Write an enzyme that holds these catalytic residues in place. Structure first.
Site, PDB file in Angstrom:
ATOM      1  N   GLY A  24       0.769  -1.229   0.000  1.00  0.00           N
ATOM      2  CA  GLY A  24       0.000   0.000   0.000  1.00  0.00           C
ATOM      3  C   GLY A  24       0.803   1.284   0.000  1.00  0.00           C
ATOM      4  O   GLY A  24       1.941   1.324  -0.456  1.00  0.00           O
ATOM      5  N   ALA A  25       0.191   2.344   0.515  1.00  0.00           N
ATOM      6  CA  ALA A  25       0.834   3.648   0.602  1.00  0.00           C
ATOM      7  C   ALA A  25       1.848   3.696   1.743  1.00  0.00           C
ATOM      8  O   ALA A  25       2.467   4.725   1.993  1.00  0.00           O
ATOM      9  CB  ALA A  25      -0.209   4.741   0.776  1.00  0.00           C
ATOM     10  N   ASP A 139      -5.180   7.642  11.964  1.00  0.00           N
ATOM     11  CA  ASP A 139      -5.626   6.705  10.922  1.00  0.00           C
ATOM     12  C   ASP A 139      -6.135   5.367  11.508  1.00  0.00           C
ATOM     13  O   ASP A 139      -5.874   4.290  10.971  1.00  0.00           O
ATOM     14  CB  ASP A 139      -4.600   6.488   9.801  1.00  0.00           C
ATOM     15  CG  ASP A 139      -5.270   6.136   8.472  1.00  0.00           C
ATOM     16  OD1 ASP A 139      -6.499   6.413   8.319  1.00  0.00           O
ATOM     17  OD2 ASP A 139      -4.577   5.611   7.582  1.00  0.00           O
TER      18      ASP A 139
END
Ligand SMILES: O=C1NCCn2cc(-c3ccnc(NC4CCOCC4)n3)cc21
Length: 345
Positions: A24-25, A139
């Protein structure tokens, strides 16, 4: 130079028998056997020296996870990188291997009230430690909550974390945000930068609603639609809630909307424990000042079989200020990453 499906993973000789996990990021994660501790581990490959934003996130995480020591927070066992700043292109973060995450679990498994209760207690116990260090995760979501076979829970990914800054939290209406949409507090879209502890509590409330029904409570399809889902359940904010919203664009947007009634928690979740719904209501409060704090959430009657304040530790050394990495380029941050990872060489 082991290769995990079309990519270099230079972790040996200590780390062998590599198998792909996700990507992912945050970089790319893999499982591997540790020949020194004779167990399998998780390795996160980060290549952040191309972008300044990625340099910030890498340094942020490394710095936080190296200071933190808590049962409900993923630790860093090892960091692998090249012996010199010139040869360093990637950073490899080694962590205890966890069996799954709450995102994967909620896709296929119904949770008993006891599991919901125990997972929530662990989230809050980890979150109490994080907030006591004056850190905001920013997050929190089910894919950032790791679990093992004995239902032990660990919070991961501090890439988007920041030091709390309540005095600098105000902003305009519909101002750009990085954190995951479905778990975004309503104030993010209205007048907040997400620099207060209350933003993490909202995310936890969304996670709790998700554990209760196996579906996200506010599944916004895009940015402004997020606030429509929130208001669609919570109803129209009261005059008192609106008095905290002083930028006129946000104020006038809320005032322009038709009156919406609150959807009662008991109708949304008819199989849920009444105490779970009472705690949910307090976490998913529109007004962030009125929203329950982590220590009150821990003291709620829903968690009384686990509540033990002497066994809910706080951080020894909180983070005094937020690191001024907003203007520092990819070169000065490369030296800080190199210095931060020196101990593992
Ligand atoms: O920092 C991170 N960013 C987001 C993704 N992520 C996963 C981890 C991690 C750490 C230790 N064990 C496992 N196990 C996995 C969990 C999922 O299901 C397969 C096994 N995952 C750390 C991160």
């Amino acid at each position: 130079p082991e290769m995990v499906r079309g990519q270099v993973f230079d972790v040996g000789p200590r780390y062998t028998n590599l198998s792909y996990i996700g990507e992912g990021a945050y970089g790319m994660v893999c499982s591997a056997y540790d020949n020194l501790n004779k167990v399998r581990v998780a390795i996160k490959k980060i290549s952040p020296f191309e972008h300044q934003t990625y340099c910030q996130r890498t340094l942020r995480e490394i710095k936080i996870l190296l200071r933190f020591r808590h049962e409900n927070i993923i630790g860093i066992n090892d960091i692998i990188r090249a012996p010199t700043i010139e040869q360093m292109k990637d950073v490899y973060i080694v962590q205890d291997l966890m069996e799954t995450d709450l995102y994967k679990l909620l896709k296929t498994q119904h949770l008993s009230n006891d599991h919901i209760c125990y997972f929530l207690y662990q989230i809050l116990r980890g979150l109490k430690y994080i907030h006591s260090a004056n850190v905001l995760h920013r997050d929190l979501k089910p894919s950032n909550l790791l679990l093992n076979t004995t239902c032990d829970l660990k919070i991961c990914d501090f890439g988007l974390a920041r030091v709390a800054d309540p005095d600098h939290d105000h902003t305009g209406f519909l101002t750009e945000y990085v954190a995951t949409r479905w778990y975004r507090a309503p104030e993010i879209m209205l007048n907040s930068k997400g620099y207060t502890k209350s933003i993490d509590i909202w995310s936890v409330g969304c996670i709790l609603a998700e554990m209760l029904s196996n579906r996200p409570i506010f599944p916004g399809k895009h940015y402004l639609d997020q606030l429509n889902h929130i208001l669609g359940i919570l109803g129209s904010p009261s005059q008192e809630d609106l008095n905290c919203i002083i930028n006129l664009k946000a104020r006038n947007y809320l005032l322009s909307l038709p009156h919406k009634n609150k959807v009662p928690w008991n109708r949304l979740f008819p199989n849920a424990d009444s105490k779970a719904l009472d705690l949910l209501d307090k976490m998913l409060t529109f007004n962030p000042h009125k929203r329950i704090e982590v220590e009150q959430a821990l003291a709620h009657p829903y968690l009384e079989q686990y509540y033990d304040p002497s066994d809910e530790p706080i951080a020894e050394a909180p983070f005094k200020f937020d690191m001024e990495l907003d203007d520092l380029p990819k070169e000065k941050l490369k030296e800080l990453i190199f210095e931060e990872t020196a101990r593992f060489q």
